[PDB]
Amino acid sequence: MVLYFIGLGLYDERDITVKGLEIAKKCDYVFAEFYTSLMAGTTLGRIQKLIGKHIRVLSREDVELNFENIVLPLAKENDVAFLTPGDPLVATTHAELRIRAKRAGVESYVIHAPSIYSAVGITGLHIYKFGKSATVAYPEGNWFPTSYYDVIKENAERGLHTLLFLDIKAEKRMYMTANEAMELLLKVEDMKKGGVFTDDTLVVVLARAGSLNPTIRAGYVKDLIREDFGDPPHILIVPGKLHIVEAEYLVEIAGAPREILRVNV
Amino acid sequence: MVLYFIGLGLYDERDITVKGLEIAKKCDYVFAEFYTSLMAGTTLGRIQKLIGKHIRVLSREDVELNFENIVLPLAKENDVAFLTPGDPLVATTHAELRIRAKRAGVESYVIHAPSIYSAVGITGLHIYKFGKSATVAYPEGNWFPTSYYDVIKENAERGLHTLLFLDIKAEKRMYMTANEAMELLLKVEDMKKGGVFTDDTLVVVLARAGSLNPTIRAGYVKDLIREDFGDPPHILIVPGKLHIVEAEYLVEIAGAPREILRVNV
């Protein structure tokens, strides 16, 4: 007689918290969605094995349109869990699902898990210096999203870093790479011409955070735009003005050009 | 030859990930630091019991001054773990420790865990709308730091939310409460008169994130400044203009007054 929103973490089934695992193991029914993000290091089977329960996977439509018809009814007389990649309430609209739970008379609890939003700390960039975030969405038809460009501009002007979540089309198995994101940004630049994103812009790419050997790379767009960062998921970051210690880390750990060590105070 | 940076998560001994626990159990030596923050819902003893390894606690000086003399030597010929509250490398000073490892010829890997930086998603506020973050420091003597006030001003005027980490005297285990933080901000306002923080400002308090029963409250300073939010730790957020969905969550889940639907959206 309760609904748990449990995050599964960044990369594989072991990124779930012990708390989340112990609770999931005792739930009567377990649901999950895998369209908000990509866990490149595991499979449904491995997750099912770990929690020792059958997992019913829901599609975006099942959730957004029928969460209260598929999940909530069972949570009224059973302990139910709803699993999601990363943290269930980060860069998703799942928070609203707690309201549906309330109105249906179902108490809900949230169990957090490692999120890419904080995992970016592994790039060596100070977390507090990250400003507003944005998502680079695939253009479709005659529609070419550009809001993310303005976010970079606004943050950069304040000396803040910009985290760019990359698009995902789970049902089509399409995961935007940092390369594709850079290509899109260069096109927006040509259009708006704000000097925000060019071949000389310093960027940082983090691929498969959560794995033991994620790809962490820093350098100029002109040099990284055609580099292989390995399998998805990928995230792209456009740093603002760097502290010397941030630059040192990018050079030593992310292989950035040693010239960035010479910051322009 | 290997050093593992392992996050302990948000609140108690079960907030570590399954991955972190299993790796920690297999390490020859386990170190930990509790100066960047504390784990309020557990004890060193309960953490040791779960990991089944003796844990050597390091002070800020041990790490900042002697990390390469205390931890790295053992990591040269053994598998060593370095536990930290939250997500490793969110704390600004942690990143450079990976450079020390490199310099010492020691491999290092990061095992993530939930961080309050991403856990604030439980407030219903969209993660992408959070801007620069800041820490409210206790004033003392003739020193009255106020940079955090400016951070709120710059975020808010851009329509962004501001995450305020509250001061903590780790060694002394003393936590700044959201109440104390509100009183401080009102004092700074009286001095700067920027119209940034007043009795009419809408704030959100998140207490004991990670716990199954965190306190999540939203309302105007005039009404929350003397409210009891429960045991530490406390986090204070000053949201910017709200999306209606954010507001409805604050009302339905955080007990915010209906007034926010018309005044703060």
Ligand SMILES: Nc1ncnc2c1ncn2[C@@H]1O[C@H](CSCC[C@H](N)C(=O)O)[C@@H](O)[C@H]1O
């Ligand atoms: N392990 C990982 N490595 C790199 N990027 C990741 C990632 N996990 C998620 N992302 C990024 O974030 C996007 C999903 S947004 C959903 C995020 C999730 N709730 C969380 O807490 O992490 C992906 O398309 C990708 O750009």
